[PDB]
Design a protein around this ligand. Structure first.
Ligand SMILES: Cc1cc2nc3c(=O)[nH]c(=O)nc-3n(C[C@H](O)[C@H](O)[C@H](O)COP(=O)(O)OP(=O)(O)OC[C@H]3O[C@@H](n4cnc5c(N)ncnc54)[C@H](O)[C@@H]3O)c2cc1C
Length: 307
């Protein structure tokens, strides 16, 4: 009776390459919604929902990939054509939230349109797929394609590697799946003993996603996990993720020089600030960020999936 949760079926560890494009837009797999829950409190700027989908084992994936969802309806401008696919990073491990290899989960922020001037909402301008997803109920069907993506696959060749994960908002999704695989699940062939460090930037406390889960790893694996948060409307210029990275810049640089992998996922808007900060930090140390970056890319330590 140990701390790691048993997962099945272990034959999901036997594949040598990740599944890709198993289902395509012309003939999607019809999955079923198991549950939908809001992840945020009243003060969040908008709703972010957690959706568990039963694919019954027919649409397996690896951590870090995405599922494509085709919302119902006709393409707003392709008469007789189906809506385009929207991609969502999978937020669960390959065994899924019920530890049985039958489900996958998505972390979806509702894209709501407000008139800038009148602040008035106009539902005809809301994002179609995200609202359809957070409006779903148990038993509803969803058309899935994929899985897709290789950029965010977790490098497992060294089980003692260092992984520094920087997310904003729904960009936390792939990291929830990495971390359950590193810490929560009993996966015999992947026993993590390195350092995983998660930085998460959100608007405020009520907008934190999966905080209870991440906080718990702090108490169980104090030597292998670090977690820092930045609340842009409730912290110590206000607080963005780049500021936290600045705070720990020496450690981070030291880790990157030692071979650490670094990942960024979430809204593309997060990137410019981060890159400014890293250049300024490098400069203070007397290093060229440009040269450092070229080296991290060459060594395959730099992983970005922003949208
Ligand atoms: C690799 C990848 C991973 C992703 N992972 C995630 C994830 O984990 N979670 C997540 O929440 N998203 C994720 N996304 C984004 C996701 O794919 C969708 O882009 C997002 O959910 C919005 O799609 P939608 O169909 O709701 O909006 P769409 O209907 O495509 O609308 C796009 C935007 O246009 C605004 N808009 C629409 N019509 C008008 C109009 N007439 N005038 C003015 N504005 C208008 C809408 O309000 C919306 O903001 C990811 C994207 C990629 C590429």
């Amino acid at each position: 009776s140990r701390s790691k949760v048993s997962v099945a079926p272990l034959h999901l560890e036997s594949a040598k390459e990740p599944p890709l494009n198993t289902y395509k837009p012309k003939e999607p797999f019809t999955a079923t919604i198991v549950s939908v829950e809001s992840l945020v409190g009243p003060k969040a700027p908008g709703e972010t929902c957690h959706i568990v989908i039963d694919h019954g084992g027919n649409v397996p994936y690896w951590e870090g990939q995405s599922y494509g969802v085709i919302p119902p309806g006709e393409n707003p401008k392709k008469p007789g054509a189906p809506q385009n696919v929207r991609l969502y990073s999978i937020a669960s491990t390959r065994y899924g939230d019920n530890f049985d290899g039958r489900t996958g989960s998505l972390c979806v922020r509702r894209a709501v349109y407000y008139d800038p001037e009148t602040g008035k909402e106009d539902p005809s301008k809301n994002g179609v797929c995200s609202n359809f997803l957070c409006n779903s109920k148990p038993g509803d069907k969803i058309q899935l394609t994929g899985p897709s993506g290789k950029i965010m696959l977790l490098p497992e060749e060294d089980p003692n590697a260092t992984h520094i994960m920087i997310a904003t908002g729904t960009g936390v999704a792939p990291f929830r799946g990495y971390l359950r695989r590193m810490f929560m699940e009993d996966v015999p062939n992947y026993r993590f003993g390195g350092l995983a460090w998660l930085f998460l930037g959100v608007a405020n406390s009520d907008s934190l996603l999966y905080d209870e889960e991440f906080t718990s790893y702090l108490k169980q694996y104090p030597d292998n996990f670090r977690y820092d948060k930045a609340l842009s409307r409730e912290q110590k210029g206000k607080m963005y993720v780049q500021d936290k990275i600045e705070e720990y810049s020496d450690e981070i640089f030291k880790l990157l020089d030692g071979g650490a992998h670094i990942y960024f996922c979430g809204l593309k808007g997060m990137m410019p600030g981060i890159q400014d900060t890293l250049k300024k930090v490098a400069e203070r140390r007397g290093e060229s960020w440009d040269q450092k970056l070229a080296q991290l890319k060459k060594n395959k330590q730099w992983h970005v999936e922003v949208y």
